[PDB]
Design a protein around this ligand. Structure first.
Ligand SMILES: Nc1nc2c(ncn2[C@@H]2O[C@H](COP(=O)(O)OP(=O)(O)O)[C@@H](O)[C@H]2O)c(=O)[nH]1
Ligand SMILES: NC(=O)c1c(F)ccc(OCc2nc3cc(Cl)cnc3s2)c1F
Length: 307
């Protein structure tokens, strides 16, 4: 299955560039921007400049109407870059002119090209002011209507995970981790035949036309490793959507030859208990003999009923 990561606007493009810098294979990066200057600096193999006649190579200067018009006019260029994709991840910062307006258009195009469409967007910091928050909210709602599943990261949550000295770029890398882990994790699920196999169809079942989603990973070792990894996987300090309310979960447990049945049940019970509703679980398991004493629990949670 073909996986594509699309950065729309300033923040989306930045997330794409920091992910390339980190290292990712089997994934195509597409950079979409009105801003020609930022595009020339993109590390993405695929670059699409939208609304060149509309903005003259500049940004959309906080007007979502410009980003929407710019993406529509370049529908053909967007389709060609997407072509072949089975799954499309659209990343954008909401609140600006480009991301807010263009990202939902890009998402609708991917969805109409038969791609499983996942949005990973940020809401602006409260310090950016009320009008920026209002425009982002309209962009978030438009994103929800265009994608299969939407993961929202309020930028204010980054202030909950930093200390007074944490560099801003390091804080931004922590938000990139949500998308990065989700992308790498899905790619791995598709590439590896697990002892209890999960494949692209299982990803579609959990993600198609769902609305809100939670994505998480937890790594743990030693005593109580399964419970610890599962609690970490469902913890959402950066996410708007919490595990509470999830009615559907795709959950995978990766472990060495020591992976016990008892601990797989302990881990699945943490997920079932945390949700508050009975969850329809799509359970997976992988035996990686290289992991030794480490256990990795991955979760994709949906069924919040809000598309
Ligand atoms: N977490 C994060 N947020 C960003 C980043 N860059 C921009 N933002 C946020 O995204 C919103 C829109 O900015 P931007 O993507 O540059 O605007 P655009 O190019 O017009 O769509 C800003 O209001 C900030 O909240 C980034 O690198 N990381
Ligand atoms: N049981 C399997 O067929 C299998 C596999 F053989 C390799 C990896 C797997 O899952 C990896 C994942 N990693 C992540 C991270 C996030 Cl943040 C969300 N979801 C996932 S799913 C699997 F489910």
């Amino acid at each position: 299955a073909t996986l594509k990561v699309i950065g729309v606007g300033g923040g989306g493009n930045n997330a794409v560039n920091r992910m390339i810098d980190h290292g990712m294979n089997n994934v195509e990066f597409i950079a979409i921007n009105t801003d020609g200057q930022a595009l020339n600096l993109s590390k993405a193999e695929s670059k699409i400049q939208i609304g060149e006649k509309l903005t003259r190579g500049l940004g959309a200067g906080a007007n979502p109407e410009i980003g929407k018009k710019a993406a529509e006019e370049s529908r053909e260029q967007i389709e060609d870059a997407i072509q072949g994709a089975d799954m499309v991840f659209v990343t954008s910062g909401m609140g600006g002119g480009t991301g807010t307006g263009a990202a939902p258009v890009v998402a609708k195009i991917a969805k109409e090209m038969g791609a499983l469409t996942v949005g990973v967007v940020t809401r602006p910091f409260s310090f950016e002011g009320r009008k920026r928050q209002t425009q982002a909210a309209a962009g978030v709602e438009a994103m929800k209507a265009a994608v299969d599943t939407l993961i929202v990261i309020p930028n204010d949550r980054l202030l909950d995970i930093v200390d007074k000295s944490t560099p801003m770029m390091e804080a931004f890398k922590e938000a990139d981790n949500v998308l990065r882990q989700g992308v790498q994790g899905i790619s791995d699920l598709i590439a590896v035949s697990g002892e209890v196999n999960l494949d692209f169809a299982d990803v579609k079942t959990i993600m198609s036309n769902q609305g809100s989603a939670l994505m998480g990973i937890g790594v743990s070792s030693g005593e109580n490793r399964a419970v610890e990894a599962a609690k970490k996987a469902i913890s959402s300090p950066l996410l708007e959507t919490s595990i509470v309310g999830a009615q559907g979960v795709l959950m995978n447990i990766t472990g060495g030859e020591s992976l016990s049945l008892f601990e797989a049940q302990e881990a699945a019970d943490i997920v079932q208990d945390a949700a508050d509703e009975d969850v329809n679980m799509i359970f997976g398991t992988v035996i990686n003999p290289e992991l030794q004493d480490e256990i990795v629990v991955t979760v994709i949670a949906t069924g919040f009923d809000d598309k």
